[PDB]
Design brief:
The structure holds 5 protein chains of 5 kinds.
Chain B (H helix, E strand, L loop, with lengths): L2 E10 L8 E8 L2 E7 L8 E2 L9 H28 L9 E10 L5 E10 L2 E6 L6 E3 L2 H12 L2 H10 L1 H12 L1 H4 L6 E7 L5 E11 L5 E6 L8 E3 L3 E2 L5 E10 L6 E6 L7 E3 L7
Antiparallel strand pairs in B: 1-2, 1-5, 2-3, 3-4, 5-6, 6-7, 7-8, 9-10, 10-14, 11-15, 12-14, 13-14, 15-16
Helix pairs in contact in B: 3-4
Chain C lengths: L6 E6 L9 E10 L5 E6 L2 E2 L4 E2 L3 E2 L5 E9 L7 E6 L7 E4 L5
Antiparallel strand pairs in C: 1-2, 2-7, 3-4, 3-8, 5-7, 6-7, 8-9
Chain D lengths: L9 E5 L4 E6 L8 E6 L6 E6 L3 E5 L2 E6 L4 E6 L8 E8 L5 E3 L3 E6 L8 E6 L7 E6 L15 E3 L3 E5 L4 E10 L6 H4 L18
Parallel strand pairs in D: 1-10
Antiparallel strand pairs in D: 2-7, 3-4, 3-8, 5-6, 6-7, 8-9, 8-10, 11-12, 12-15, 13-15, 14-15
The chains are: A mainly beta, B alpha+beta, C mainly beta, D mainly beta, E little secondary structure.
Chain lengths: 241, 279, 100, 204, 10
């Protein structure tokens, strides 16, 4: 433990709506900073503060502001969030060793419209008979599709509990529409058991996907259900056959 | 010859009258080149010698942020010192820090320093070997344990042998025309009667640089310390320095007394006696 | 708490030549703590436009400041330094003397 | 890290080997260096700090710094699967900026005992007209390329660990909403073993 | 150049 606290953990907002991400730390560190991280571009410093009321820009300051009125706090302020500020943000602090310890991360998506937000749809695909006959193994595939933003956590549950053996999930979501601007996303994961285990109709498999979407405070007046933070799942039973 | 760089930082609390006043100055040898003053309007590190002006705007931002942060750190250290010494919030206190590096005639590292005094008494200092701290008292020992845990000694050593030394080379090269100059001392003697039996001889050294100088009196080639008044070397305000040494002598004996001047810009030490017809 | 009384010198930048421009200096050194009042005087009166160097200190931690103003020495005008410090029971006045 | 030996993409090491990440930094005024480990979509974790020339050691990590060559490097002994991550190093500016160099993606590959490369079709559990294609059991040698067709999705490769069976395997998934799409040709644009098992979609 | 001294507190 003994780390920084970033608030919130996930956030969707429309272009232009002022927002601020908090960073606090009860370790009495003089040095605090904010970083973003982007595919291809590395981890870059936005703003940093070497002490109370001392404040300097990093390599990517534009569109951001900070303040340091007290030691414990370093807020990141976006006056007019722009689509290019869609990113993964980390806060960090350091004391006398000058080693910076990093917060857990804030995933921020800046969208042209909240109407672009969708929960994932989820499907489990049953092991192939061909495979069981060929390898005496059986792999389930989960597919989560149509989700925006890519703010998801996938997990596999067997017989009521989460499993980890035989699992692997894509590091990164795919864009369903590499053309479109706020393209929806898809994610895949596989769970592999023995043939015998899969062939047991007592075994129950669920693929679970936590999605982080619109909070209670967001205005929604549309036919479809409010794309709030929620869980969507898909299940399969073992089959003798 | 050998060179130095030093920053001298002073925090002075003024309770009831706002935050402590913070002043830092940088020097290369005897020549100031930067200042920072928490009470000043700019709120910037500022140039104080012509040759630091060629530094781009990135340099001023960097230096500005570092020294501001340090003012806040020493501001904090003042609060901590109060607690350790159970001193009152209504009394005024001082915290000085000094650090820097010396390089020899070749420009290689020679000596490094990183020191603090609280109310004008050594609190904590990096030893000459740059490997450990010398703590003055129980309080400074808590500070030592902290800094040992965060490897400040290793960090500051890296700085003193590296950046500090690199900084100094760059400054010396950039201020070549003035920093590498050695102005030799201009000399003369003055005679004071005081009494008919005893008269004062004063030996003058003017317009020299760097400040380091030795004025010494000799009667019949003897190292005199009886009746030898020596004043602090003083700045003239044009980047040069002044000093005088004085002897009270029995009268008529002027011609047997002699003043000796040693300075970096004098290949041979100067010998002075009252000389010309007079006394 | 350690306290050190100032050393005061008042002197001209160049050797004084009546009617020629020059600088009048008051150099205080070796003092602690750093609060200090210094005036340069012309015929017992405060000179109004006085500058000073930035506060610095020596190896032994004690402070020094240079107070200076431009001036044109004359045969009759008398200049001096007036210094006040915590260590002093009263302001010290040192008279500028062409042979120090 | 953006020079003549600029760190380039991934680094893979045989499981059990020693990993060598050697990086160049440009700014000769760099003094303190910090190694971080970052797992995919997780926080960078500090693993090693180094303030002066030489080597520092903690368990299986050695941090190295050569101020002459301008090299900073990390060595990982006895590479484990769980060592797979991005490795970042950072140094301080003359202004107290922390600047990260080129990160290094490290994949520790385990040897596949008996690669049984094959392409399977899996039917959805409810809406059984939907399906996916699964390329599984290939060697660490093969590379899964993205599709020619824009309407077909192919995922990168991924390793799973059947812990209790001492068995690991590679897999990639392909799917598409196109009617005429078939598993048989889903991986056409990939260079796949001559020996890849392609069964009639269903079954046995 | 001034040293980075942040966190070097008593």
């Amino acid at each position: 433990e003994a780390q920084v606290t970033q608030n919130p953990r996930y956030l969707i907002t429309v272009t232009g709506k002022k927002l601020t991400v908090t960073c606090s730390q009860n370790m009495n560190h003089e040095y605090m900073s904010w970083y973003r991280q982007d595919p291809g571009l590395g981890l870059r410093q936005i703003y940093y503060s070497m002490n109370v009321e001392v404040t300097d820009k990093g390599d990517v300051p534009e569109g951001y502001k900070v303040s340091r009125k007290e030691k414990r706090n370093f807020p990141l302020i976006l006056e007019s969030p722009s689509p290019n500020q869609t990113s993964l943000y980390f806060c960090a602090s350091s004391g006398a060793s000058h080693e910076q310890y990093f917060g857990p991360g804030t995933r921020l998506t800046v969208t042209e419209d909240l109407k672009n937000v969708f929960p994932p749809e989820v499907a489990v695909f049953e092991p192939s008979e061909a495979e069981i006959s060929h390898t005496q193994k059986a792999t389930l595939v989960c597919l989560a599709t149509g989700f925006y933003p890519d703010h998801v956590e996938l997990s596999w549950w067997v017989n009521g509990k989460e499993v980890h053996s035989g699992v692997c999930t894509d590091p990164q979501p795919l864009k369903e529409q590499p053309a479109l601007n706020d393209s929806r996303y898809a994610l895949s994961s596989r769970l592999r058991v023995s043939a015998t285990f899969w062939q047991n109709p007592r075994n129950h498999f669920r693929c679970q996907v936590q999605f982080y979407g619109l909070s209670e405070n967001d205005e929604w007046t549309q036919d479809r259900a409010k794309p709030v933070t929620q869980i969507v799942s898909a299940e399969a039973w073992g089959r003798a056959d | 010859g050998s060179h130095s760089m030093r920053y001298f930082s002073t925090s002075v609390s003024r309770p009831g009258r706002g935050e402590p006043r913070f002043i830092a100055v940088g020097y290369v040898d005897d020549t100031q080149f930067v200042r920072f003053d928490s009470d000043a309007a700019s709120q910037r590190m500022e140039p104080r010698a012509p040759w630091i002006e060629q530094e781009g705007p990135e340099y001023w931002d960097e230096e500005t942020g570092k020294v501001k942060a340090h003012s806040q750190t020493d501001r904090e250290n003042l609060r901590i010192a109060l607690r350790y010494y159970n001193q009152s919030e209504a009394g005024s206190h001082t915290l000085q820090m000094m650090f820097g590096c010396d390089v020899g005639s070749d420009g290689r590292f020679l000596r490094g320093y990183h020191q603090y005094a609280y109310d004008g008494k050594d609190y904590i200092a990096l030893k000459e070997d740059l490997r450990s701290w010398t703590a003055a008292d129980m309080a400074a020992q808590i500070t030592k344990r902290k800094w040992e845990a965060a490897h400040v000694a290793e960090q500051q050593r890296a700085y003193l042998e590296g950046t500090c030394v690199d900084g100094l080379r760059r400054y010396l090269e950039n201020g070549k025309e003035t920093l590498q100059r050695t102005d030799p001392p201009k000399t003369h003697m003055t005679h004071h009667p005081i009494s008919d039996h005893e008269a004062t001889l004063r030996c003058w050294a003017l317009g020299f640089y760097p400040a380091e100088i030795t004025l010494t009196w000799q009667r019949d080639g003897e190292d005199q310390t009886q009746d030898t008044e020596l004043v602090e070397t003083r700045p003239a305000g044009d980047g040069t320095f002044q000093k005088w040494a004085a002897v009270v002598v029995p009268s008529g004996e002027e011609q047997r007394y002699t003043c000796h001047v040693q300075h970096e810009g004098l290949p041979k030490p100067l010998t002075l006696r009252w000389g010309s017809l007079g006394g | 708490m350690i306290q050190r009384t100032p050393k005061i010198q008042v002197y001209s930048r160049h050797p004084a030549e009546n009617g020629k421009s020059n600088f009048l200096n008051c150099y205080v050194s070796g003092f602690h703590p750093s609060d200090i009042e210094v005036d340069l005087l012309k015929n017992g009166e405060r000179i109004e436009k006085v500058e000073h160097s930035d506060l610095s200190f020596s190896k032994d931690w004690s402070f020094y400041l240079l107070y200076y103003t431009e001036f044109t020495p004359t045969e009759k005008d008398e200049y001096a330094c007036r210094v006040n410090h915590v260590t002093l029971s009263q302001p010290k006045i040192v008279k500028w003397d062409r042979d120090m | 890290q953006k020079e003549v030996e600029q760190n380039s993409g991934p680094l893979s090491v045989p499981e059990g080997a020693i990993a060598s990440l050697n990086c160049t930094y440009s700014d000769r005024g760099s003094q303190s260096f910090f190694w971080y480990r970052q797992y995919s979509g997780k926080s960078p974790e500090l693993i090693m700090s180094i303030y002066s020339n030489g080597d520092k050691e903690d368990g299986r990590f050695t941090a190295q710094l050569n101020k002459a060559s301008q090299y900073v490097s990390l060595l990982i002994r006895d590479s484990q699967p769980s060592d797979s991550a991005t490795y970042l190093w950072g140094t301080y500016n003359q202004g107290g900026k922390l600047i990260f160099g080129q990160g290094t993606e490290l994949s520790v590959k385990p040897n596949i005992q008996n690669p049984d490369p094959a392409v399977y079709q899996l039917r959805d559990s409810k809406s059984s007209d939907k399906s996916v294609c699964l390329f599984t059991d290939f060697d660490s040698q093969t590379n899964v390329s993205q599709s020619k067709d824009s309407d077909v999705y192919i995922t990168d490769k991924c390793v799973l660990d059947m812990r209790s069976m001492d068995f690991k395997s590679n897999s990639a998934v392909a799917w598409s909403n196109k009617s005429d799409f078939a598993c048989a040709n889903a991986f056409n644009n990939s260079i796949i073993p001559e020996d890849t098992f392609f069964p009639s979609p269903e079954s046995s | 150049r001034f040293p980075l001294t942040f966190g070097w507190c008593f």
